[PDB]
Design a protein around this ligand. Structure first.
Ligand SMILES: [Mg+2]
Ligand SMILES: [Mg+2]
Ligand SMILES: [Mg+2]
Ligand SMILES: [Mg+2]
Ligand SMILES: [Mg+2]
Ligand SMILES: [Mg+2]
Ligand SMILES: [Mg+2]
Ligand SMILES: [Mg+2]
Ligand SMILES: [Mg+2]
Ligand SMILES: [Mg+2]
Ligand SMILES: [Mg+2]
Ligand SMILES: [Mg+2]
Ligand SMILES: [Mg+2]
Ligand SMILES: [Mg+2]
Ligand SMILES: [Mg+2]
Ligand SMILES: [Mg+2]
Ligand SMILES: [Mg+2]
Ligand SMILES: [Mg+2]
Ligand SMILES: [Mg+2]
Ligand SMILES: [Mg+2]
Ligand SMILES: [Mg+2]
Ligand SMILES: [Mg+2]
Ligand SMILES: [Mg+2]
Ligand SMILES: [Mg+2]
Ligand SMILES: [Mg+2]
Ligand SMILES: [Mg+2]
Ligand SMILES: [Mg+2]
Ligand SMILES: [Mg+2]
Ligand SMILES: [Mg+2]
Ligand SMILES: [Mg+2]
Ligand SMILES: [Mg+2]
Ligand SMILES: [Mg+2]
Ligand SMILES: [Mg+2]
Ligand SMILES: [Mg+2]
Ligand SMILES: [Mg+2]
Ligand SMILES: [Mg+2]
Ligand SMILES: [Mg+2]
Ligand SMILES: [Mg+2]
Ligand SMILES: [Zn+2]
Ligand SMILES: [Zn+2]
Lengths: 99, 95, 129, 144, 149
RNA sequence: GUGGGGGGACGAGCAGGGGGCUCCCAAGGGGGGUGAAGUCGUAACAAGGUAGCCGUAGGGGAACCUGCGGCUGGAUCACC
RNA sequence: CUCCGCGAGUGGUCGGGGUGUUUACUGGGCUUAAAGCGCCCGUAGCCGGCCCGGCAAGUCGCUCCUGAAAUCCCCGGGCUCAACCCGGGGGCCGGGGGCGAUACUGCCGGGCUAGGGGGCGGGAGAGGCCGCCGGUACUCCGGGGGUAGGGGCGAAAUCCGUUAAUCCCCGGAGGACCACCAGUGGCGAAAGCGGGCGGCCAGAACGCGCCCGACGGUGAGGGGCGAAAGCCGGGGGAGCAAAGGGGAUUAGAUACCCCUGUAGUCCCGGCCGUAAACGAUGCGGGCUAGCUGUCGGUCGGGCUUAGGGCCCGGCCGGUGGCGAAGGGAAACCGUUAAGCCCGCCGCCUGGGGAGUACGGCCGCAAGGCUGAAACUUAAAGGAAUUGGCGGGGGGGCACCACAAGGGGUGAAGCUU
RNA sequence: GUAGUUGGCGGGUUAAAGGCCCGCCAAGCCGAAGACGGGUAGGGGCGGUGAGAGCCGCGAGCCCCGAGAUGGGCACUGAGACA
RNA sequence: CGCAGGUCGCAGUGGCAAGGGGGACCUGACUGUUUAACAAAAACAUAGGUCCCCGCGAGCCCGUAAGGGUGUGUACGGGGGC
């Protein structure tokens, strides 16, 4: 599943310390943090740069925005997003409703 | 031995039934295998001599359907235990 | 999926004969069906074999005479040598005088009696009695 | 539920493999092929064996009957296993002593297991000190 | 599905047993062939081409009239298909499903429909390689066949 | 003919591990199963006295009880 | 004591064969007795439409070289017959050579459309995924009316209520569900799917002189989907409710009832991979009386709420009931077969020990899959019949029953 | 699973072909049509049983082939032995 | 970095430099801190778990007071226990 490990992939830097449960939590969060995300503006599948916690930057379109601590968009945050970036979905409705 | 070719519930060509809840109960069954007797129902029974055609008294009569399980249906006399030859005879359940 | 036409045709005769039918339609058909029915008609187990022409291969309509007690195709099509046919004879037939087997020999399809006179074996096809 | 299965003319090899697969469902075949008779039987595949009597012990007949069938405990010379051997005949236990070589042999019964009302005994004594117990019991010989 | 279907229908066209040229036909064998090429250059597939001939032009069957088949007729006049028409239809059906599955990853009903279609593709590739109508090295790569949509 | 040093192929044997394959002995326990009916209840068979059973989870001297979903092998082949 | 079987033999324990169609090629079974994997995609294998031409691999016929001797079968002869020995023929299931046949299988070539796939048309469908909206009901919250009960039960009690309850009205919030219509109705491979509108998909049925031309079936191993409970992390939480708390009942009551109550139930991502996952009935194809209800399509006739509507009849495809032939131990199945056949896969071989132990693999875990043996045992088991019995149903009857009555006995002394 | 393992080229040795052995080159060879591993067994002519298909090996004794001479190795002579 | 050949010693990482190893129990998870000058530990801390006081004009604490710390903070937070 991972490059050189079976289950402890991102958290393999910790070795055999800190406990399986603690390291397992790190693997769960870190896999989404270090995965591929869609930029909320350009919708590219790109590895966003996390400047700090809650600060994300898209290397393609340069979009800098506030998100989750380790993931660019939390579950609740994905519903209260600004509607300026909800233009594709808005026109998607107006194509369907008008046709 | 397989009593009844029906399996006790006229389900049909499906896999699962939505099922209901039993009044006076909750043991219940699926939508089939559940007794659904309907009775006429009306409040204030035969007062229509002194009511209705006395004052104005516009009275109402609401058809009510009741759902029961095999335990409650046998308990209230809606269902008997018929003989084997009588099991295949289709009789209405007195409404 | 339809695999062997001869077994299908021979079971149709068994089904239709057991209902006391006058005739039976057969479809689809090949030369092996025809050459077997000719051997059957030659031994009085089958009436006239009329042929019909459709786009789908053709049909045979066979008049039955109530002359069949049992019938069927031997499967698989076992090779048989001439000295062996006596052994296969008692396998599918009742009595030494009653019934025949249908063999597919290199000289053509014949009854097992006509194969014994020619002193040749072949590939077993069916039995009738 | 139809057409037994591998019936083709060129299905000989597959047909033989399928029939060999279900031979193992037969307990008799599996025991013979696995060498189970000669691994757990105290007689070790032989029809009889020698042994030394240790203690005269009595087993009780099964529930419908009522009796105390008089057997003996034997230790096999070739194995050292201890088995209970039935001493037959009226008064046959009186011809048995302690520390005497006896020839131990199967009691019969179904499948080499125990006999009718005797529970859990598979052997019976046939020889005591090199002379047959039936010979002693009939008077035709005397014990040495 | 392919197996364990609830219904096994019989719908098909009952053609005449030995079809011959219709006496009402106002088209020579050369006119019939040229009509098919115009439809083919228009872009209709060989299955739909025959429907237009019968429904619009009243040509019952191109085979008895011309002695050839529709793909053979179109083949002679330079109309060559990238793949056989049945195979190209199944490939286009997979792309339209795999496009659907992108935005709906949890469409389990559509996934099984993709698996049925993607197995029908594999059977036809096995057949077509044996008869040589497609190259022996042909591989169904869904990403390598995106142009066929 | 030889006697030393050595190199070579073959190769016993003795030292060691290494792995299995097996097989015994082992304080102590672990789940079991047979007797003959000793104790406590009465869980299953009838609507077995709370219809029964299957999977799963929790709980309890014990049989077992309860929650969820399923089955009739139900005590119903039957609404208007 | 007498009789029985065999007799220079006759017994005991073992092993093989028969027994035994309990290993089933001939020749078993799998609804309920043991036995169809929960469902499906498919590799090897096995099995595969029709016609024409070629080869002659299989196959068939003849012949040859062989398949040591002994052993085996037949015939003749010699020991007194016999066992045995000698002579001759056959076989000893096969290998190869030559010459012939081409019916079937195989291969090669050409051609078809009947199986299959791909299409076009109008319809059907709780088929799926996503978005938006609604319907009552419910619980809670705020306010107004009105006092004192409410709730619950077999009966109570716990409990809620005098900081205003239950009940009624005006508003708000929330989560789950989709009543009637509604059906042995529909869809789906199984699991499963029930409010409306919409978008994206899927799979079928019917109608067809549309396209390809056998492209097919089954499928070990391999893969994917797979109720409920449960596990991992996040959100949510109305009602219900394992565990727990309390009120009762009880001999006991860690149960059944009541009040309350937390996971859970719901959504998302992942895991688990089991179920009476059932039609206890594997998948594909053909043939074999019928009558009847209903769903989809279509064609013909008759009407029209002039409708995509209704009725009658035919075909195709589903879904129920009764029932030919036939089958079955029987219940029963019977064109939706458990009938007559053709294929392929899975499984079973008395009960218990036991879905246990060891090993392996899988899983976060719970656990799951695969899965014995020693030992013990003579039955376990299916269906059906007669009865017995039931805190099942129905009817009939009786002062050794009751109801309406009369007199009593049971207490004292005494007789027994 | 295999790493002289599978093959090629050149050699040595042999009475004689051969990864039999050696120098170099390559990555091949086997496997679910069941490798590899484990267990059991000398192979055949044949024998027992059954009406037969078949099942079993009493496939000990007689004949043919094989291997061995307390366990493991290595040589002399000789046409021939590693006796 | 490799290959081939020859060759000397008792000894070739020849001096210098430079791990003995293995099994098992108790105990603290671990890295970390500690009685300067007799105790380095199994003690303290720790990440993780959980409980309590608190909606900010709070809670807890300092100051005689003026006033201050937590606080350029706000429950995914501050403080207080285990
Ligand atoms: Mg179900
Ligand atoms: Mg016994
Ligand atoms: Mg195939
Ligand atoms: Mg009870
Ligand atoms: Mg409990
Ligand atoms: Mg409770
Ligand atoms: Mg059987
Ligand atoms: Mg099934
Ligand atoms: Mg299973
Ligand atoms: Mg398949
Ligand atoms: Mg030949
Ligand atoms: Mg002779
Ligand atoms: Mg011979
Ligand atoms: Mg499989
Ligand atoms: Mg669940
Ligand atoms: Mg409650
Ligand atoms: Mg709650
Ligand atoms: Mg089943
Ligand atoms: Mg049966
Ligand atoms: Mg019937
Ligand atoms: Mg199992
Ligand atoms: Mg295990
Ligand atoms: Mg009775
Ligand atoms: Mg009275
Ligand atoms: Mg008195
Ligand atoms: Mg050479
Ligand atoms: Mg070698
Ligand atoms: Mg000898
Ligand atoms: Mg030696
Ligand atoms: Mg020697
Ligand atoms: Mg030093
Ligand atoms: Mg420490
Ligand atoms: Mg330290
Ligand atoms: Mg100090
Ligand atoms: Mg110190
Ligand atoms: Mg500490
Ligand atoms: Mg901890
Ligand atoms: Mg404390
Ligand atoms: Zn961007
Ligand atoms: Zn009820």
């Amino acid at each position: 599943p991972f490059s050189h490990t079976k289950i402890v992939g991102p958290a393999g830097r910790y070795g055999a310390r800190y406990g399986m449960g603690i390291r397992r939590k790190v693997t769960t969060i870190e896999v989404k943090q270090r995965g591929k995300h869609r930029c909320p503006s350009c919708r590219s599948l790109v590895r966003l740069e996390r400047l700090a916690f809650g600060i994300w930057h898209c290397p393609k379109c340069g979009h800098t925005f506030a998100g989750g601590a380790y993931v660019p968009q939390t579950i609740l945050g994905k519903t209260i997003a600004p509607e300026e970036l909800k233009g594709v979905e808005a026109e998607k409705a107006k194509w369907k409703e008008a046709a | 031995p397989k009593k009844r070719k029906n399996r006790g519930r006229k389900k049909g060509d499906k896999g699962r039934e939505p099922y209901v809840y039993c009044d006076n109960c909750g043991k219940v069954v699926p939508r089939s295998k559940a007794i659904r007797l309907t009775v006429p129902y009306s409040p204030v029974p035969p007062d229509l001599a002194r009511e209705l055609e006395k004052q104005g008294a516009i009275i109402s009569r609401y058809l009510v359907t009741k759902t029961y399980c095999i335990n409650c249906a046998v308990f209230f006399g809606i269902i008997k235990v018929r003989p084997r030859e009588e099991r295949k005879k289709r009789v209405p359940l007195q409404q | 999926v339809m695999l062997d036409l001869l077994s299908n045709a021979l079971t149709a005769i068994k089904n239709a004969e057991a209902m006391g039918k006058r005739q039976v339609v057969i479809w689809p058909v090949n030369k092996l069906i025809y050459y077997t029915l000719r051997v059957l008609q030659r031994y009085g187990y089958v009436g006239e074999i009329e042929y019909i022409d459709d786009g789908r291969g053709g049909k045979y309509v066979v008049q039955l005479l109530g002359k069949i007690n049992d019938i069927g195709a031997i499967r698989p099509r076992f090779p048989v040598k001439y000295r062996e046919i006596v052994e296969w004879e008692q396998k599918y037939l009742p009595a030494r005088q009653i019934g025949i087997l249908v063999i597919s020999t290199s000289q053509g399809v014949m009854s097992h009696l006509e194969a014994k006179e020619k002193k040749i074996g072949g590939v077993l096809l069916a039995y009738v009695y | 539920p139809g057409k037994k299965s591998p019936y083709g003319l060129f299905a000989g090899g597959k047909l033989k493999k399928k029939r060999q697969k279900f031979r193992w469902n037969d307990v008799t075949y599996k025991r013979r092929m696995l060498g189970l008779a000669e691994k757990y039987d105290p007689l070790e595949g032989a029809p009889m064996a020698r042994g030394i009597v240790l203690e005269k012990v009595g087993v009780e007949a099964r529930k419908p009957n009522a009796a105390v069938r008089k057997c003996v405990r034997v230790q096999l010379v070739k194995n050292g296993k201890v088995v209970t051997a039935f001493v037959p005949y009226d008064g046959g236990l009186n011809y048995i002593n302690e520390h005497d070589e006896v020839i131990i042999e199967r009691i019969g019964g179904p499948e080499g297991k125990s006999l009718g009302d005797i529970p859990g005994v598979r052997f019976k004594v046939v020889k005591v000190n090199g002379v047959s117990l039936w010979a002693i019991w009939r008077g035709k010989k005397q014990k040495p | 599905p392919h197996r364990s279907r609830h219904k096994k229908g019989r719908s098909s066209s009952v053609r005449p047993p030995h079809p011959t040229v219709p006496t009402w036909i106002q088209y020579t064998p050369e006119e019939v062939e040229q009509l098919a090429v115009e439809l083919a250059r228009r872009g209709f597939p060989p299955s739909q081409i025959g429907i237009i001939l019968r429904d619009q032009y009243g040509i019952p069957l191109v085979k008895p009239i011309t002695g050839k088949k529709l793909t053979k007729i179109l083949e002679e006049h330079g109309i060559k298909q990238e793949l056989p028409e049945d195979l190209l239809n199944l490939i286009r059906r997979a792309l339209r499903i795999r496009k659907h599955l992108e935005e709906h990853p949890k469409d389990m009903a559509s996934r099984r429909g993709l698996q049925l279609v993607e197995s029908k593709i594999h059977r036809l590739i096995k057949y077509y390689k044996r008869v040589g109508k497609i190259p022996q090295d042909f591989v169904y790569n869904p990403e390598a066949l995106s142009h066929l949509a």
